[PDB]
Design a protein around this ligand. Structure first.
Ligand SMILES: [Ca+2]
Ligand SMILES: [Ca+2]
Length: 290
């Protein structure tokens, strides 16, 4: 992989790259959303955090929300950067996905685009871990979810960048406690590739966190394994389960179909989650490999 050094602490990362500068958006350290920058991709340094003061309407839909926001997603589309983020409490269902936007990340000025989708105690999903994906035809979609019924997918309209239509279930894990979250979808050579994270995430060195993927000819279509197992029945070919140094990799994201970023727990540093970046390749069958 890319050996990350310096201020390489991150959790639930999403990579982007404006000009020659890499930007990793992550779960906030303290309050808001954490951002770290890099000129070469290997040395990272701290960057101004998003939402230093909590937004007012967060208290409306997630009143008990933790001061730090979770799992951001950053991408450029239709001439503007889109930043989806989560507002929630841990192990809780009262969650809400918000949206921030800017024309240029280096300006540091983000517009408040409002609530995207909410989840309450009555709902069977969790509105965290968002991820934007653009169709082969160029239309936006949002995949999200964490435990409960699992991963949900909805179509976004180009105007509001907010959900329209109905929610589509694309990955579930009923025989393993629904332990699936952090979805990200990408299109490449006719197939959509849904990456997800399996099992438990916040146990540090001892956390059981995996990265599994699946393919489907349709964005909402049945996602399958190399074995042919539907991701709605726990299907997931494991791309990374960890090594002796990095334990419990997860909350991954892919950039430009060539870079998979990921947070892993450093066994040589008391299990603090660091940033792990890999060039993502594809085998003879188009499946993602390192
Ligand atoms: Ca994500
Ligand atoms: Ca993404």
């Amino acid at each position: 992989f890319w050996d990350t050094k310096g201020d390489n602490f991150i959790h639930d990362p999403s990579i982007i790259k404006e000009g020659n500068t890499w930007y990793t958006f992550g779960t906030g350290l303290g309050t808001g959303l954490r951002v770290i920058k890099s000129t070469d991709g290997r040395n990272w340094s701290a960057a101004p955090s998003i939402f230093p003061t909590p937004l007012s309407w967060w208290k409306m839909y997630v009143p008990n929300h933790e001061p730090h926001q979770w799992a951001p997603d950053i991408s450029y589309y239709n001439g503007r950067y889109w930043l989806y983020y989560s507002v929630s409490s841990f192990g809780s269902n009262t969650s809400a996905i918000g949206l921030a936007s800017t024309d240029r990340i280096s300006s540091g000025q983000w517009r408040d685009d409002g609530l995207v989708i909410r989840s309450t105690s009555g709902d069977q999903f969790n509105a965290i871990d968002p991820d934007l994906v653009i169709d082969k035809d160029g239309n936006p979609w949002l995949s999200f979810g964490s435990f409960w019924s699992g991963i949900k997918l909805t179509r976004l309209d180009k105007n509001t960048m907010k959900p329209t239509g109905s929610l589509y279930s694309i990955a579930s894990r009923p025989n393993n406690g629904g332990a699936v979250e952090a979805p990200n979808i990408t299109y490449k050579d006719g197939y959509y590739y849904l990456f997800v994270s399996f099992d438990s995430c916040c146990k540090g060195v001892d956390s059981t966190y995996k990265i599994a993927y699946g393919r489907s000819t349709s964005i909402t279509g049945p996602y399958y394994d190399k074995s042919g197992k539907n991701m709605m029945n726990g299907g997931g070919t494991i791309l990374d389960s960890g090594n002796d140094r990095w334990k419990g990799p997860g909350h991954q994201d892919v950039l430009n179909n060539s870079i998979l970023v990921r947070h892993a727990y450093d066994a040589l540093d008391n299990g603090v989650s660091k940033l792990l970046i890999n060039d993502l390749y594809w085998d003879s069958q188009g499946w993602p490999t390192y």
